[PDB]
Amino acid sequence: MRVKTIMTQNPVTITLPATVRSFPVVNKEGKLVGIISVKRIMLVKRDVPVVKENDTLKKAAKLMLEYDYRRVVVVDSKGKPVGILTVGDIIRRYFAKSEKYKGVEIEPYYQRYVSIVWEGTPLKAALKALLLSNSMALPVVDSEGNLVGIVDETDLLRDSEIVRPNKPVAEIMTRDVIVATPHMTVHEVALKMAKYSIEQLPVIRGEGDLIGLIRDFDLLKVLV
Numbered sequence: 001m002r003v004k005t006i007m008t009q010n011p012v013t014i015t016l017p018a019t020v021r022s023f024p025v026v027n028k029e030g031k032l033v034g035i036i037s038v039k040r041i042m043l044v045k046r047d048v049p050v051v052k053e054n055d056t057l058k059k060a061a062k063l064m065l066e067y068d069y070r071r072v073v074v075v076d077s078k079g080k081p082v083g084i085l086t087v088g089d090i091i092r093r094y095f096a097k098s099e100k101y102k103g104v105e106i107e108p109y110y111q112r113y114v115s116i117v118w119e120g121t122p123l124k125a126a127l128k129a130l131l132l133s134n135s136m137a138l139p140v141v142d143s144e145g146n147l148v149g150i151v152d153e154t155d156l157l158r159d160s161e162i163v164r165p166n167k168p169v170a171e172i173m174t175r176d177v178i179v180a181t182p183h184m185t186v187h188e189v190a191l192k193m194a195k196y197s198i199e200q201l202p203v204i205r206g207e208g209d210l211i212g213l214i215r216d217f218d219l220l221k222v223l224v
């Protein structure tokens with residue numbers, strides 16, 4: 001599979017000078033000069049991964065892994081943006097739809113190292129851990145290390161005190177955790193990521209014995 005099949009075509013761009021998730025940045029001629037993210041409130045990053053629409057998904061995946069960046073801008077011969085390809089696109093439009101990955105377990109790809117947090121941890125400390133995690137979410141465990149929940153940035157909005165403060169993360173965590181196992185296929189993991197709109201599934205054994213984490217980013221390694 002090629003980039004052209006999985007990318008989102010004709011991305012909205014922003015031409016400099018100037019005052020979704022991010023917008024490709026171009027000059028007067030329309031050539032790509034960087035990308036700007038909404039979170040990053042020059043603020044434009046120049047060293048962004050780029051590919052052509054006829055390149056393989058493998059090439060785009062390699063670049064994402066190389067720059068530890070979640071998207072690549074697709075340009076034409078003129079170096080002008082004609083599409084955008086994100087990790088999300090690869091998961092939802094490719095891994096979750098292709099028949100090729102129904103026969104590939106995630107055992108060789110999931111992370112054995114995972115940042116977690118005890119459910120009794122005050123929110124601020126839990127947020128510090130989230131900030132220092134390579135995952136968008138922190139699996140939550142009880143006092144004995146058993147998996148009991150999971151939490152991410154969006155869960156902060158579950159705190160009624162935002163209507164305008166350092167309680168246990170247990171108060172905003174998601175209790176029903178969608179999990180994976182080492183033998184689960186890339187196909188099924190992607191199906192779950194797409195279905196629940198989540199970027200990671202804790203990897204377990206037994207009923208709640210945490211042994212790893214499979215992130216959408218980890219699935220890119222399958223393409224290599």
Ligand SMILES: C[S@@+](CC[C@H](N)C(=O)[O-])C[C@H]1O[C@@H](n2cnc3c(N)ncnc32)[C@H](O)[C@@H]1O
Nearest residue numbers: 150151152154174176177178197198200201202
């Ligand atoms: C639907 S995801 C979307 C996150 C996306 N980055 C966003 O900003 O919209 C956010 C929710 O999924 C939950 N979540 C994350 N991973 C999960 C998992 N493995 N199992 C169950 N729920 C999960 C989080 O706790 C949170 O309530």
